[PDB]
Symmetry: D2
Subunit: 134 residues, 4 copies
């Protein structure tokens, strides 16, 4: 996507680090990245952005809604482009593996539960902690 239109969308001055990090997420191979993952990846692509900046920019992106922040294993923060796959996850509680899913039935029931009570749905989070039965 057009990073510069997005940064204007979110009320954020277009600056070099903001554009480099957003390009990294857009083009990232792995969908769930730690702040350290983004910093390692920028080094790889030969971009000079310190870990402190990387985390601050991810925090602005989250607050602006560009990115969703999770804590699946409890011990480190995951950032994820804020698209519609970002809200439905199964977590293997023994390995830390994260698996996205989408079930139209559950998406529809969620809107029902909330309208029947006089509300509109702003946002849903569903996390399914799972174990491989055998």
């Amino acid at each position: 996507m057009v990073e510069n239109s997005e940064l204007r969308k979110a009320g954020l001055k277009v600056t070099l680090p903001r554009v480099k990090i957003l390009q990294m997420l857009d083009s990232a191979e792995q969908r769930h990245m730690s702040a350290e993952d983004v910093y390692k990846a920028l080094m790889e692509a030969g971009e000079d952005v310190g870990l402190a900046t990387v985390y601050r920019v991810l925090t602005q992106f989250e607050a602006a809604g560009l990115v969703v922040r999770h804590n699946f294993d409890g011990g480190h923060a995951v950032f994820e482009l804020a698209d519609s796959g970002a809200h439905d996850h199964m977590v293997c509680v023994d390995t830390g593996e994260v698996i996205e899913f989408m079930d139209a039935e559950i998406e529809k029931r969620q809107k029902e539960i909330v309208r029947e009570r006089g509300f509109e749905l702003v946002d849903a989070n569903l996390v399914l902690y799972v174990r491989k039965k055998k």
Copy 2:
């Protein structure tokens, strides 16, 4: 419930502060309490437990599974006795009001989504952020 059987359940030496705080939760009027709420309430009932202890004991309880920890408004931690109502919440994103719900349809679909993929369900969290439409 019998606090002392619970503390043994969870691998926790029975001590005065652990039993006072657990009695407070069991008998609390409000279901979602900050650490500050529990400390204020203990003062009220005329029990001498410092804020630092209160938070540490809640942290042990969470880790032992006796209590569930949420962050609904992003700005403060909520502790909640770990019963079956502790995993399904709507949050009014303008007021911070939290409302528990239970929908048997959604509970059943969640088990389906996970067995059809070779897993057993250890735990589910569902948070519905809502706005009062009018």
Copy 3:
């Protein structure tokens, strides 16, 4: 008492809530406010900002460097303007009373420690948990 100029240096478009929250933090300059505390105060003043809007603006400000975020008692987040005094606190473990202090000897020793190591000092944080 409000500033769009503070927001610009931060690289942040000027908006109703950013301005209202920012001058709220300024016209209440030593309180150590939670997100809820800010939300309550705006309601008094008669603003209309949702609670989630408050917390997202305060997080934007933290990232931008306009505000410092602490968690003193473990339970709730404190948002403080990034002034001199915002990095040195004593904290009463039993009550959660928070108290800013500033000690020039301490602040001098910090810079010497760092200089004697070939580093420059970007920021320091000191928290003293105390009782009695």
Copy 4:
């Protein structure tokens, strides 16, 4: 190298994972490990502890006072044995390099500040963010 006696003082029943994780933290005493780092090491050693079990044990230890929890780079939690040295760190903002230091002048001034105020000192934390 493992201790059920450490666990007892903490008020914690002695269990397989608590013991295995505890001696893992001891036989790797200056690493500043994440929950994942601990989980990986146990797998090497050939233990069988789930990742979520690791993190819950480390949280129990933090609450019990056996371990100190830091978040140095903002992104992941660090779990450190609560020894001397576990509360004073420099931190390279650009790389996340972490370095323990201890300075007796600083440690002396801290106790004077607190004493001159009628307080006793329960715990202090110093973090110096540095570059170059």
